Design a protein around this ligand. Structure first.
Ligand SMILES: *C[C@@]1(O)C[C@@H](C(=O)O)C[C@@H](O)[C@@H]1O
Length: 252
C-alpha cells in the first residue's frame, strides 16, 4: 500500500476519511457556503466545480477557488468537475475540462484533483503526469448512475485506474437490488485483499447502498461522503451522523 498524505491527513490508514462537497452557483454563493462549511467537522473539502455557472471562465473558476482556500487555509481541498455523463450538473468539452484541471493544479490552491477515467486513457495519463509534476494528487473516478457492474468488472476498472497512475481510484455505482450492494462490497474487499497498492474509494449509491458509505473500515473504502445540508449524490447522510457511525465502528 502506498498511502496518500495531504496536510497531515493520511488516506488509506485508520478510519475512512470524511469528504463533503461544496456546491455554489456563483462567487457569492461559494463564499457563503465556504463560511458555513468551515463550521462542520470533516477531513476533506471537495469543491464541485460543475455546480458553478461561470465555468467558461478559467479566471472566474480560479477566483472561486481562492475564496474557498481563504476561508479554509488548512483544509485538504479536492477540485472536482463532475461531468453530466457521470451524474454532474453540466457538460463541457474535454479540452476545457483538462484546461480547468491544469489551472487548478497550477494555482497551488488545491491538494487533489478528480479525473474521470472515461475521459480517455491518453488524456488522463498526461494529466496525471502533469498533476504529479506539480505535487498534486489525483482521485481517478468513475460513476455509474444506472447500474452496478459485476465485481470482477469493478476490480478491473479500479486496477486500470491504478495502472494509469491514480493515487486514489474511486468508483460509485447505482444498485438495482440489494444484491448489487453486496457486489460493491465484494469488489471493495477484493481490492483490499489482493490489489492493495493504492487506497480506493467505493460506494453503492442511493438509500439501498447507504451501508457501503458506513462500512469502509472493514472492507476497504478509504473515504466516504457526507452531506452538510444537501447531498452531492444520492445516498449521502448528514455528515455528523456519518461521523458518529464511523467512530462507533472504529472503536467497536
Ligand atoms: C466522488 C463523487 O462522485 C462521489 C459522490 C458520491 O457518490 O457520494 C459525491 C460527489 O460529489 C463526488 O464527486
Amino acid at each position: 500500500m502506498k498511502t496518500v498524505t495531504v496536510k497531515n491527513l493520511i488516506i488509506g490508514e485508520g478510519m475512512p476519511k470524511i469528504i463533503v462537497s461544496l456546491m455554489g452557483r456563483d462567487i457569492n454563493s461559494v463564499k457563503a457556503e465556504a463560511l458555513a462549511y468551515r463550521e462542520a467537522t470533516f477531513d476533506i473539502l471537495e469543491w464541485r466545480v460543475d455546480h458553478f455557472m461561470d465555468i467558461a471562465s478559467t479566471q472566474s473558476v480560479l477566483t472561486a477557488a481562492r475564496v474557498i482556500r481563504d476561508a479554509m487555509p488548512d483544509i485538504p481541498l479536492l477540485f472536482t468537475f463532475r461531468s453530466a455523463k457521470e451524474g454532474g450538473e453540466q457538460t463541457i468539452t474535454t479540452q476545457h475540462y483538462l484546461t480547468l484541471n491544469r489551472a487548478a493544479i497550477d494555482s497551488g490552491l488545491v491538494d487533489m484533483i478528480d479525473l474521470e477515467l472515461f475521459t480517455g486513457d491518453a488524456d488522463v495519463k498526461a494529466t496525471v503526469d502533469y498533476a504529479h509534476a506539480h505535487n498534486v494528487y489525483v482521485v481517478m473516478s468513475n460513476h455509474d448512475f444506472h447500474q452496478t457492474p459485476s465485481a470482477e468488472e469493478m476490480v478491473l476498472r479500479l486496477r486500470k485506474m491504478q495502472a494509469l497512475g491514480a493515487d486514489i481510484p474511486k468508483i460509485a455505482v447505482m444498485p438495482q437490488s440489494k444484491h448489487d450492494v453486496l457486489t460493491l462490497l465484494t469488489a471493495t474487499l477484493e481490492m483490499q485483499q489482493h490489489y492493495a497498492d493504492r487506497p480506493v474509494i467505493t460506494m453503492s449509491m442511493a438509500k439501498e447502498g447507504v451501508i457501503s458509505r458506513l462500512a469502509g473500515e472493514v472492507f476497504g473504502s478509504a473515504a466516504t461522503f457526507g452531506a452538510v445540508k444537501q447531498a452531492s449524490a444520492p445516498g449521502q447522510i448528514a455528515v455528523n451522523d456519518l461521523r458518529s457511525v464511523l467512530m462507533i465502528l472504529h472503536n467497536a
